[PDB]
Design a protein around this ligand. Structure first.
Ligand SMILES: [Cl-]
Ligand SMILES: [Cl-]
Length: 270
């Protein structure tokens, strides 16, 4: 159930631009949604928001709220896809605030330093958080509330949801799943279009369609290859996915995905 009005009144797939993209984060691709995430804290924002207690936090909540409003605007006729994008952005905001977001950008680098300086000036003696990880733990509920408020303002939706444990899932795994939610859907649809055209002049239709299908396949196959590198490199440290292939991970462990052996494994894993 959505936050009250009281609470609410107070508020493509890019291979480059990743920290350590040739090393630890080799193979990581940035979701378009992440590339576009609405959140930026400049020196000037810090300078002015720090003058009133709660204002720096409020500025962050406003960004989270606006990100969610934007996402619902984009996914206006699909509540599920809207809510999942919101969860993903929520989680990324979490990594940004905690200073371990993978994007190589100023906001990803500077947000934590700005936040923690504001926490130092106000929370030196009152037992409130002095570091960003503790802050996230105590305030993520507020962040989500702002997103739910923001989500509601798009089209007066009265249907909110929780975020489960999305912020506790390693960022690269979330981004891979998100890629999964787009591609397995494309894969299902493109298979059906192919079958309907080629196996229901209709010959020029089939060749044309088969051409476009191969192109879609090449693009995703390249992306599939890169992310598999990162997944296979990193799965060792997670006891509960270490024996899974990247196919099996998306098929079995991604409830938002709708990936199957037919639309994923047989298509990209040869
Ligand atoms: Cl197609
Ligand atoms: Cl995990």
């Amino acid at each position: 159930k959505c936050p009250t009005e009281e609470i609410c009144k107070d508020f493509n797939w890019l291979g480059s631009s990743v920290k350590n993209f040739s090393s630890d984060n080799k193979g990581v691709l940035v979701p378009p949604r992440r590339q576009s995430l609405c959140l930026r804290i400049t020196l000037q924002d810090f300078r002015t928001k720090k003058k009133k207690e709660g204002d720096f936090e409020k500025f962050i909540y406003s960004y989270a709220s606006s990100e969610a409003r934007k996402l619902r605007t984009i996914h206006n006729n699909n509540l599920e896809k809207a809510h999942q994008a919101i969860r993903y952005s929520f989680a990324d905001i979490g990594n940004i605030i905690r200073g371990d977001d993978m994007m190589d950008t100023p906001t990803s680098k500077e947000t934590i330093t700005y936040l923690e300086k504001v926490l130092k000036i106000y929370n030196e003696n009152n037992d409130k958080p002095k570091d960003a990880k503790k802050w996230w733990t105590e305030n993520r509920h507020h962040v989500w509330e702002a997103m739910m408020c923001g989500y509601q303002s798009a089209q007066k939706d009265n249907q909110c949801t929780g975020y489960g444990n999305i912020d506790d899932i390693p960022q690269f795994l979330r981004w891979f799943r998100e890629w999964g939610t787009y591609v397995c859907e494309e894969s299902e649809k493109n298979m059906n279009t192919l079958k309907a055209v080629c196996f229901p002049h209709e010959n020029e239709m089939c060749s044309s369609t088969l051409k476009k299908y191969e192109e879609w396949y090449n693009k995703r196959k390249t992306e599939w290859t890169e992310q598999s590198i990162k997944y296979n490199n990193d799965k060792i440290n997670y006891t509960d996915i270490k024996t899974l292939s990247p196919s099996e991970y998306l098929i079995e462990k991604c409830p938002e995905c709708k990936c199957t052996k037919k639309n994923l494994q047989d298509v990209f894993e040869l």
